[PDB]
């Protein structure tokens with residue numbers, strides 16, 4: 001409904017409000033209060049931090065999920081959608097020609113009734129986005145969007161620049177209140193700002209770190225909480241092909257584009273290199 005669609009944006013409104021208020025706070029008040037050359041230097045650094053935050057946040061929010069291609073879709077009519085075991089055999093015969101090595105716990109082919117999709121490996125259905133999403137990490141209320149194959153790099157860059165911004169604001173307010181305490185000048189209310197920054201920082205520390213873990217090992221959140229099932233059973237490392245190539249699968253080979261939110265991730269969204277094949281030519 002209209003109500004629901006409005007309510008889905010409130011986390012984004014909250015983060016955007018906190019960020020804009022921190023901008024207004026630092027730029028005028030705090031930057032003025034703490035040499036002209038120094039002030040301009042720090043104002044331009046702060047502005048670069050701000051622009052990278054908004055850049056990465058925007059592309060995290062507004063990059064739609066990647067979706068399985070036609071080859072993975074069943075083009076059935078409403079009539080044909082009907083006996084379950086014949087469907088099982090049909091899906092098996094189709095999967096004979098698809099690069100799908102993961103199965104359900106029962107061993108069945110993973111299939112989405114809503115999208116009519118033979119799910120690729122690492123693809124999962126999001127009921128919020130209401131679509132199958134390739135290498136879906138998780139649906140994020142905070143970016144009002146799925147985080148997966150298409151935007152994961154933008155998400156991690158957004159966490160990083162969020163952290164840098166938090167450190168900038170926190171350190172600035174600390175210096176302001178120290179200089180007040182040493183009588184070299186207060187705006188007591190901006191103390192709250194510090195308490196906010198700190199909080200977010202520490203939160204990001206747990207989040208960033210966690211994702212570091214995931215990215216180091218080529219593991220999605222869903223996979224971390226439910227290991228994928230292969231022909232020989234569950235395997236927590238089925239897609240782990242080494243730290244370097246795990247990192248480059250997300251950030252690409254070109255160092256210049258690592259820290260900017262332009263799409264640079266490797267592979268199609270469907271087949272992902274098996275750890276078990278990592279030394280096969």
Ligand SMILES: CCCCCCCC/C=C\CCCCCCCC(=O)O[C@@H](COC(=O)CCCCCCCCCCCCCCC)COP(=O)([O-])OCC[N+](C)(C)C
Nearest residue numbers: 206208209210211212213214215216224225226236243247
């Ligand atoms: C671009 C980023 C990449 C950079 C390189 C990354 C280097 C490598 C990074 C990390 C490798 C370090 C591995 C630590 C494992 C310790 C042992 C341990 O706890 O075992 C436990 C798992 O362990 C965890 O659950 C870890 C949780 C992560 C918390 C945040 C710390 C991240 C480290 C921050 C690093 C920041 C480095 C600085 C980054 C600039 C137990 O295992 P289990 O029983 O199988 O768990 C089942 C849980 N289940 C129930 C949910 C299924």
Ligand SMILES: CCCCCCCCCCCCCCCC(=O)O
Nearest residue numbers: 018022140142162166169196197200
């Ligand atoms: C007052 C200083 C700045 C405070 C605001 C800084 C920006 C913090 C934004 C953190 C958002 C984290 C979103 C996590 C999403 C997820 O894990 O699904």
Ligand SMILES: [Zn+2]
Nearest residue numbers: 112115125132
């Ligand atoms: Zn689906």
Ligand SMILES: [Zn+2]
Nearest residue numbers: 126129139146
């Ligand atoms: Zn979603």
